[PDB]
Amino acid sequence: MDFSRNLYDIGEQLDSEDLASLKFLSLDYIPQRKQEPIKDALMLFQRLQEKRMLEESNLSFLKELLFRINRLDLLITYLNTRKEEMERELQTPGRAQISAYRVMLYQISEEVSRSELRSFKGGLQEEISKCKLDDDMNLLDIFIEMEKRVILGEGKLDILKRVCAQINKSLLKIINDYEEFS
Amino acid sequence: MDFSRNLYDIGEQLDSEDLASLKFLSLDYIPQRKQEPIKDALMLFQRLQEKRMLEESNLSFLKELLFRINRLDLLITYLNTRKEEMERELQTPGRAQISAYRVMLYQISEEVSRSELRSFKGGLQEEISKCKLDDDMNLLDIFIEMEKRVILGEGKLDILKRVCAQINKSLLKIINDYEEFS
Amino acid sequence: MDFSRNLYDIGEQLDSEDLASLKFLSLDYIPQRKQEPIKDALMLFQRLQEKRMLEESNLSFLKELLFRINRLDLLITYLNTRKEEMERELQTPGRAQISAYRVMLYQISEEVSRSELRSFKGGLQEEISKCKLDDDMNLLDIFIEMEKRVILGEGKLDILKRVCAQINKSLLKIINDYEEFS
Amino acid sequence: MSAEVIHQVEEALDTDEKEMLLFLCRDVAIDVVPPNVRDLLDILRERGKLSVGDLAELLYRVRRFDLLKRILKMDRKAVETHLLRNPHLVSDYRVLMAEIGEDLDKSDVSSLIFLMKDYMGRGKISKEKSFLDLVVELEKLNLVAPDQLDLLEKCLKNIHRIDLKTKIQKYKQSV
Amino acid sequence: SAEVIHQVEEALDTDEKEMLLFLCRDVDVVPPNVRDLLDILRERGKLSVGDLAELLYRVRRFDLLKRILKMDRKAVETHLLRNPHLVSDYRVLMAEIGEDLDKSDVSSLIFLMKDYMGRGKISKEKSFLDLVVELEKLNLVAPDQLDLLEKCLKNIHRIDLKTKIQKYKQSV
Amino acid sequence: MSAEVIHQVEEALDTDEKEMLLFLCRDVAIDVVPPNVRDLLDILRERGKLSVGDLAELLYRVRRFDLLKRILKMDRKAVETHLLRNPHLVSDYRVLMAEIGEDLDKSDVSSLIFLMKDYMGRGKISKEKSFLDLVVELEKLNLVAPDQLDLLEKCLKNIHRIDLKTKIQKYKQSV
Amino acid sequence: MSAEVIHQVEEALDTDEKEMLLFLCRDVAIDVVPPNVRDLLDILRERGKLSVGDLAELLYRVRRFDLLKRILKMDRKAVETHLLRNPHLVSDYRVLMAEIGEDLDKSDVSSLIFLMKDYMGRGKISKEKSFLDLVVELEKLNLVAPDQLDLLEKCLKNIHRIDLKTKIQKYKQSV
Amino acid sequence: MSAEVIHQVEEALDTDEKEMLLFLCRDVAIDVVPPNVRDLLDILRERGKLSVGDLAELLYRVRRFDLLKRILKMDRKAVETHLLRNPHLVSDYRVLMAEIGEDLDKSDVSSLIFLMKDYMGKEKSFLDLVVELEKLNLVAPDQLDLLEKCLKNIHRIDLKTKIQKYKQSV
Amino acid sequence: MSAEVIHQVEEALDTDEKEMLLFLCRDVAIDVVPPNVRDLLDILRERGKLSVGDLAELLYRVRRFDLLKRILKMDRKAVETHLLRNPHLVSDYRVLMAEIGEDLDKSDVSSLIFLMKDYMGEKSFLDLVVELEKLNLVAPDQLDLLEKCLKNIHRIDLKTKIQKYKQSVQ
């Protein structure tokens, strides 16, 4: 049971915030109902195994997930993969199992502070009730709610650009780079 | 219940900053998953007891931990041990359960003021997002993040030297002494 | 409801500096962990009531604490006790509950100005790190740190006299008087 | 009337006024205790004591006129006239307690819970509680009543506040 | 082809079993037990290797497909593309909707639908599939009309699933 | 009409609705007490009181429109029109009782059985019962009647439920 | 009176009350054990000890007022007056045993049979039996009598139910 | 008395007071554990130990005076006089334990259980802790050394004074 | 000895205590699995394997000293002397398994289940133990799998306990 031991060892090094980041980054393969009861990395790994995405002979998805959340130490320590190999592999078309849209959204979420979060919540109060704009809701929850209310998506980005135009300017540069990726 | 009473008395004198230092000094034996839900020293003592590193017949680790953070009154009062005995015991090879690298990091962390802390934050903007530039973050969290992103490993210290070169020379002296140690 | 009303009336008058002085003067009864969350006189009064040292029948401790901080008006107004009676009670052996060591430390803290404080900070940079020698620190913080590092105590006073000999001689007189009394 | 309007009102309310709404309706439904706003509204609907006018009055009490305009399509003038010419669903004592509680900050509720610590216990007051929780706790021990407010008035006097005492005396004379 | 059915039924989940029963409601009264349903399906001759593989594929349990039935995703995908003998598009869409609603959303749905349904009929702490089958029994949601379901789903501020319905309806 | 349709109806009904069907048919089949639905249907068919219209009315009264559209190939409009211009096999009292039982949940039936456990045998209703079973037990004691409903109204008012009391009053005023 | 009315009354009863009716007539028909309800009723009627009033009392002892009003056309007041003005067909001890059995739930009869398994057969009472069957078994051994209830009182006390013991003591003191 | 009073009492009380009532009534129903307060009150009514006075006293111990003023139509003076005259059901031990557990916050109980963890092996309350200690036959109305010692050890002397007062009274 | 004694024992126990007692008496339930604890006590009584000392041993092995003192009129010293002098009913291996199961938390047992799910095809530790015994993987003489699994989850204290028990048998 070496594989289970390695997976448990990897899961012991992830805290609540990283678990939430992984849960947000794995929306395309785990629906809301299967995602709500998840409170630890072991449940997420079991769910990934059930769909035959993570196994002994297929570690690509786990490597990608651990690379995109920037936890580069676990890759070298346990999975035995350096940064150069992942950087070379990801840029090859057809070898990325996570859409660039989600990565861009998470990168944007990384660059928001508490004051910026409050400004973002105040700006987007037009179409969202104050009950869903509570202090518990972080930026990822706001993005998920916007996706649910079909005001933000792959084809819909004007609202995000307009909202980000007030808080900062480099966010528009990131969005333009993502558009260049298209 | 003399032993439990003694442990409670020792844990009654440790405030938040000393608790954070103690948690940082013991990352080699407590993963982040157990690190997160710790708010009082009693839980840390229980976690240490669960690994047979602290009990009635073995108190070396507690003495080392209380000596490394410069708290000698507790040692002389609730443990009956003086400075010279601890120094001689630590000088003996094979008795240091805490790596010298962690002690060097903690000593560096004690030698930074607020303005120097802001300068250090500014000098590390290259490889770290602006979200960690918050006033809440101390130097220990920066060190933890750098260790996470494999830029402050035990074998790799060039980045730390380059950053510290713009603040003070005593930090470089400490780093050079640590390198001469091993 | 009269006794609690009187306690609240007493607690309203005190300011932040008097609160810090009272917190320092009661270190022998309230540990650091319970000392940290105290931010107002009501919390300290509740802490004292927990240990059964302040109540309707027993009011010696509060009167002594008010007298030791040169607050005679509160003693004569909200406690109905004169200065001479308190001095006579304190002069009785065994009646005083605060050790004279803390009293003389507080008197020395009173007898030091800002420039003298900076000179004291500069004089003991060898045995105390720069972070603990921060500008916001007062003489009481330095005394607490020295007590923690077992360099200043009842049995050890060489460092205190050595440092104080370069500032003023009245402090030496106070130290000699304390030594003679002990 | 329907469930849709109740759901919209519940989801359009923040957590700040939810405690206000729970406390305000204690006298209407005193036999049971509701856990959340939706259950309270459902209980009133089942009991037959909730209608368009009652909901309008409750929304007017909590100072949320925008919800009245958007949802119920009513202005404060009509509901005020109806309140004047019809019996009130909520007593004046509850609205007085709410108004008093909205005029106190965090630096005063601690003083109040310290002053009356003898009657209550340390565990009951360990968490941060608004004035409404203290009023409910006092009412449970039968110390404060709509026709008996001496203790609360004296306690407010002891904390060096006079305007609230004037409001209490004004309500007492209004009886 | 008899003992493997025991392993399959013992390797499933309660909510998975409920979804399986809902999917198999298309093909008589459904037995309360999954084992009895499998036995009846084998008795009728409808049970087959391809049909069972497609049924397990419809619930996203590929680990059991490779573990027990010795089949991969490509083979079952091709077999389904050839012909969907057992299940239809409507039940798949209903399962897809049911799998995308959290506890708060289904609670709000049952609260809203308590209007013209009895309190004991829907009870509480139920899944979206139970509400769907209750509406099917009451005969107000059928593959020909879904306007009431769409309106209720829009009322709870969930428009993406309304798109899903629109796309499915416009597919034909 | 035939036996195959009877069997199909029997197999397509769950356990919960079987009790409702038995309760609704108690008045019509009073000579014997049936233990199962199939025997009751056979007796009604033999007696000549079972027909397409009667079965359609019975299935409409249990809210199973899909079986009407599938087995009997009739929709809601046709059965409603047939019911409007035909004598009612089931009395309005029985359907009112069925509706009241439909509009109650566990948290209320527990209160009812706890409250009215005193009048009847404590061990008689020891097993968990539904509202229909409690109504049957009350009817066995000649306490609730198709013309006498004061006791039921009082019991419903005792549990803080007024809308059902208004429904009872509406039914009383209907006659 | 007639055979048809007796047949209807017999078939109208359920399976649960059949055992009660069999037990209550043990003293009246003591010469021969009754095989079923119909034979017992026929023997009682042919011997002249059963009449309309006796049948009304028997139905009153089982609390079936609906059958009394529907079939016998007699309310509770008439049968109560008839019982008051005529000698009792069933002994007070039998009706007391019936009431005690009714007031006991299955969780308690299990405790009784488990506790008293030692005195009686090891597996004689292993079959699920109500309190009436246990009383009959005890009477078979002549351990409980109308004038001997101390053992039954102790057994009832052994299950922590003192109200039934008080009722037994009240009956003993009254008679 | 009647089922109406019991139903109203069950509806009025919240969860913490229900737990306190269960602990207080644990002594009389020492042989049967009631899962719900409804079952406990039904058992007391069946055993004949529940009356108007006993119910009033039980509600007074939980410190719910509004229920006495509303349901039982009694004031605290009458129930106090009845307690002073008629013997009380719950022992002074149980009310003393309730008094001690009322004044302990959520942090002191954690330290106390950490101190007690030597003798045994999880959001605990002081009532559950004292029940667990009683199950092991360590704290009884005859033996109170452990609780007094540990209460002194965690720097809480007012509770030690309360325990000393209770011991002096008996 | 009498029926009421075992009746009181069955009624006073708790659900977790009932499950632990049912598991701990697995050796003597070879004839049939007892669905209920009262049925198990009946089987033990009728088979001649139950007595005052045996019931005292069972009550002592589940940490219910209050029942020992109140019901059977015994203390800890008496039952310890009885255990020392008279032969044991239940082997120490079951006692060790129960002791280990009393210390593991919910997260720890969940991680253990996840680790061991590879070998096998919510569950408490005792259910995992009985499932492992069903597959003939863990035996009273061989404990390599359990020891390695416990070491892998950083709970080395239970590994020390297992090593001490293993040294005890030799």
Per-chain topology:
The complex is a heterononamer, with three copies of chain A (182 residues) and six copies of chain D.
Chain A: H1 2-11, H2 16-25, H3 32-35, H4 41-50, H5 60-68, H6 72-79, H7 83-91, H8 100-110, H9 114-123, H10 139-148, H11 158-167, H12 170-181
Helix pairs in contact in A: 8-12
Chain D: H1 3-11, H2 15-24, H3 37-47, H4 52-61, H5 65-72, H6 76-85, H7 92-101, H8 106-115, H9 131-140, H10 150-158, H11 163-174
Helix pairs in contact in D: 1-3, 4-5, 4-6, 7-11
PDB class: apoptosis
Keywords: caspase-8, cellular FLICE-like inhibitory protein, apoptosis
Assembly: nonameric
Order of helices and strands of chain A: HHHHHHHHHHHH
The description of the largest β-sheet of chain A is: none
Secondary-structure element string of chain D: HHHHHHHHHHH
Percent strand of chain A equals under 5%
Rg of chain A, nearest Å: 18 Å
**Total strand segments of chain A:** 0
CATH topology of the largest domain in chain A: Death Domain, Fas
> Count of helices of chain A?
12
- Strand content of the residues of chain D, in percent? under 5%
Alpha-beta content class of chain D? mainly alpha
CATH superfamily of the largest domain in chain D: Death Domain, Fas
Shape of chain D: globular
CATH architecture of the largest domain in chain A: Orthogonal Bundle
Percent in helix of chain D: 55-70%
Strands of chain D, count: 0
The CATH architecture designation of the largest domain in chain D is: Orthogonal Bundle
Organism (chain H): Homo sapiens (Human)
Protein name (chain H): CASP8 and FADD-like apoptosis regulator subunit p43
Organism (chains A, B, C): Homo sapiens (Human)
Family (chains A, B, C): Belongs to the peptidase C14A family.
